[PDB]
Amino acid sequence: MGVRFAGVNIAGFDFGCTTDGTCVTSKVYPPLKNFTGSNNYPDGIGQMQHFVNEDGMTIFRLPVGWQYLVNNNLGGNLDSTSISKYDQLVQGCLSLGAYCIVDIHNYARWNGGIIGQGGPTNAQFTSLWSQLASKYASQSRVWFGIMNEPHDVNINTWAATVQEVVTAIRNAGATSQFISLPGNDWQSAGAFISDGSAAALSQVTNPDGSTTNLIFDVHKYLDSDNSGTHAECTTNNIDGAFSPLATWLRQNNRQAILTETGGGNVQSCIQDMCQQIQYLNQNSDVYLGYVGWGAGSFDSTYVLTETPTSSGNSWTDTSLVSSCLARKG
């Protein structure tokens, strides 16, 4: 009676990342309360506990900068401090019984260079994922979010890169986990088929030749330019994106997850987001879940905030989360 996974992005390890793939590591603001000893960074783990206990959520996405994980050492070993801090957020998510999406928030780029297309080589990128897969191989509820919002890349070359990553993840022993396949056009669900991403990514397989647990990863916003930067919503995305996608998915016996979606905490979005979510829930054979953007280190002033408010051991949700994303039933 609905998609399997409902949850939210717990952002902050990605603050300082821009759409060119530059992540300034000094600017991260991770949602771990005691990240520095001040004990007053945003309380991502406390948020997740509320989301799971009160709002029936079962998945969280944890955006993080590539540069952060390797401390700016392209192709290097994961930095022991960085991975130690990030893993605290990962384990907090997993401890709640949720699935946890590790999301490399890099737009298929490193400091302006496109992975495998002038920027880092495929090997420098698979090296990142091989290490993460090795770390998380024994934890089946870690979900490998290969890349956030590739855009303006050669989709044929990108699909090959994605294939190399999937191979690396499986060969490292992470054989049980879900793996995301992200396409072009900022992962837009609306362009996923028409821009050729669906076809190219459909060719990616596990070592055994199957496509088992390889899930198409799309994004879609509800404002006029599909940017998620305006408060008001202007579409429920059904005719333009999710109906054609459902049909395609179903005919091909494949599945997709919507890892970013959101809107203002206003009436237009309460209406449109609920229509969108309802359609996903009525097509839960092909849609595995939805993940709202965004909570974690975002606060009450962020236009798409989904961060709950703590008041005397009580949390209160934003209106869009409470009215549309939450599952209190």
Q: Which residues bind Mg ion (CB under 5 A)?
A: 49-50, 53, 185, 188
- Say how far apart CA 286 and CA 257 lie, in whole Å: 9
Nearer to Mg ion among residue 189 and residue 320 (C-beta):
189
Pick the catalytic residue from 54, 164, 232, 260: 260
Given the DSSP bridges, would you call strands 179-182 and 214-219 parallel, antiparallel or unpaired? parallel
Nearest 5 degrees, angle CA 237-CA 251-CA 283? 45
Residues sharing a CB contact under 8 Å with residue 73, sequence separation 6 or more, in sequence order: 79
260 is catalytic: yes
The residue (of 63 and 308) whose beta carbon lies closer to Mg ion is 308
Task: Quote the least distance from Cβ 188 to Mg ion, whole Å.
Answer: 5
Report, in Å, the least distance between residue 49 CB and Mg ion: 5
Of 145, 146, 148, 60, which Cα lies nearest the Cα of 96? 60
Q: What CA–CA distance (Å, rounded) separates 149 from 324? A: 24
Q: By the 8 A CB rule, do 57 and 326 touch?
A: yes
CA distances from 327 to 92, 228, 309, 310, 312 (A): 20, 23, 18, 19, 23
Among residues 54, 149, 164, 306, the one annotated as catalytic is 149
Residue with smaller CB distance to Mg ion, 170 or 220: 220
| CA distance linking residue 165 with residue 107, whole number of Å | 15
| Closer of 177 and 188 to Mg ion (Cβ) | 188
Query: After which residues do gaps appear in the chain, with C to N over 2.5 Å?
Result: none
Least distance in Å: CB of 194 to Mg ion? 11
Residue number with CB closer to Mg ion (75 or 244): 244
Give, in degrees to the nearest 5, the angle at Cα 143 between 138 and 144. 100
Closest approach, Cβ 220 to Mg ion, in A, equals 10
Question: How near is the Cβ of 314 to Mg ion at its closest, in Å?
Answer: 8
**Which residues are known to be catalytic?**
149, 260
